[PDB]
């Protein structure tokens, strides 16, 4: 996996991740071929940017999802 | 066979074979069994458990 982003992956993550339902570190790492530590880093950055909303915040797993449509 | 039979009501035929056993074969094949001394004096056939 890519331990860190590149040109094609970073903007793709910023453009499409808050557009489908399930946003978990494992799913995003598998889908975007990113590491799994970069998954958590980029996902917490997305949470701070305000494009997704958190669900669980548990030590084992953290769940995010796209913003509600309205 | 009944499902795949061409005829509407076909009673399947049977087999009619009369086996002959030497006692050496019959005992080993469990056709007949050893019996107690008084049980040997009974000659009527065993029941069939038909009902």
């Amino acid at each position: 996996n890519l331990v860190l982003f590149d040109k094609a992956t970073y903007d793709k993550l910023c453009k499409e991740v808050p557009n489908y339902k399930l946003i978990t570190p494992a799913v995003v790492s598998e889908r975007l071929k990113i590491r799994g530590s970069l998954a958590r880093a980029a996902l917490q950055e997305l949470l701070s940017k305000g494009l997704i909303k958190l669900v669980s915040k548990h030590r084992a797993q953290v769940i995010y999802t796209r913003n509600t449509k309205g | 066979i009944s499902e795949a039979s061409v005829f509407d009501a076909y009673v399947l035929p049977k087999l009619y074979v009369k086996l002959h056993y030497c006692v050496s074969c019959a005992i080993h094949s469990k056709v007949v069994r050893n019996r107690s001394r008084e049980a040997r004096k009974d000659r009527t056939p065993p029941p069939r458990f038909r009902p």
Partner: protein
């Protein structure tokens, strides 16, 4: 009202078949705040029928040695999995769970002793308690084999396996085994 994990009211789930309707314990009187109750539902025969189905899931989760008493881990696992299925489907987690078990219930099997002289595998039907037991065992072990050697979390793999089994689109491992067991039942019926 019962609010299992604080939400997901059980008042709406129904079981479309009565063979499993009288053995699933999702109803209001069997509705539990938490999937953790030491009621001795293995004391005698047919006890587990009234045992809550989510409690059955948590019991079946802890398997294969390294984690055999970690009921709290299994509770939070089923909590996270229900949250994931609710986010990506939107309906009742209990409803999709029960429909998954119904879809994966193997109505036929083979006893394998159809002839003692030579393997014949006489095809027999399945009692509904055995239906639900085999279904839950199949689903839990399917998730178990899903999350062995990858980034995939156990809750996520359990979630997607459960939803696939509920939809019955042949891509769930429990369905892959249910169909083939029924297939051998057809073959040596």
């Amino acid at each position: 009202d019962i609010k299992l994990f604080g939400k997901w009211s059980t008042d709406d789930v129904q079981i479309n078949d009565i063979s499993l309707q009288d053995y699933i314990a999702v109803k209001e009187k069997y509705a539990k705040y938490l999937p953790h109750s030491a009621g001795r539902y293995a004391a005698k025969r047919f006890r587990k029928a009234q045992c809550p189905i989510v409690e059955r899931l948590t019991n079946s989760m802890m398997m294969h040695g390294r984690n055999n008493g970690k009921k709290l881990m299994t509770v939070r696992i089923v909590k996270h999995a229900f949250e994931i299925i609710h986010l990506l489907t939107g309906e009742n987690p209990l409803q999709v769970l029960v429909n998954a078990i119904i879809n994966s219930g193997p109505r036929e099997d083979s006893t394998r002793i159809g002839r003692a002289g030579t393997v014949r595998r006489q095809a027999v039907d399945v009692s509904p308690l055995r239906r639900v037991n085999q279904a839950i065992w199949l689903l839990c072990t399917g998730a178990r084999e899903a999350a062995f050697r990858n980034i995939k979390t156990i809750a996520e793999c359990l979630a997607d396996e459960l939803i696939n089994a509920a939809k019955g689109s042949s891509n769930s491992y429990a369905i892959k085994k249910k169909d083939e067991l029924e297939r051998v039942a057809k073959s040596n019926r």
